[PDB]
Amino acid sequence: LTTEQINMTKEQKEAQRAQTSDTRTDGTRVAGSVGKQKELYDQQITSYKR
Amino acid sequence: ATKAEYALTKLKLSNESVTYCTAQYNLSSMLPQQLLMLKNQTTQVAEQTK
């Protein structure tokens, strides 16, 4: 069970890293739910300007 | 009184005999099993360190 908690800790770290950073620990761009959420803000920002 | 004391010494052999068998069982069974218990605990400490 301790070994399994290692993976969860790593994944929860990525969720924290989603803030204040656009890249994960390995360097790839975030694309999950938080990545989709940011794209919605970009469209909304353009919508308000338009 | 000496005869009564002789019976007490004679009967005391039973306690010594069962003690030897009890100690023999502990060495043959309990001690090796405890070693396996300690080894698993040692591995858990490293995982918690990780």
DSSP per-residue codes, A1-49:
-HHHHHHHHHHHHHHHHHTT-SB-SSSPBP-SHHHHHHHHHHHHHHHHH
Eight-class DSSP state of B1: -
Nearest to A30 by CA among A20, A22, A19: A22
Radius of gyration of chain B (CA): 21
Residue A24 and residue A14 in contact, taking contact as beta carbons nearer than 8 Å: yes
**Phi and psi, residue A23, nearest 5°:** -125, 145
Distance (Å, whole) CA B42 – CA B24: 27
User: B30 in helix, strand or coil?
Assistant: helix
A17 class by beta-carbon count within 10 Å (0-12 exposed, 13-18 middle, 19+ buried)? middle
Cβ(A41)–Cβ(A48) below 8 Å: no
Residue of chain B with shortest Cα separation from A10: B50
Q: Structure resolution in Å?
A: 3.7
Distance in angstroms (rounded) separating the CA atoms of residues A1 and B49: 14
For this PDB entry, the determination method is cryo-EM
Measure in Å the smallest separation between the Cα of A26 and chain B Cα atoms: 19
DSSP symbol at B3? H
Contacts of A6 (CB under 8 A, 6+ apart): B50
Which of B48, B41, B49 shows the shortest CA–CA distance to A2? B48
Residue B29 sits at the chain A interface (C-beta within 8 Å): no
In angstroms, rounded to a whole number, what is the distance separating the alpha carbons of residues A3 and B46?
Answer: 10
| B49 to chain A: closest CA residue | A2
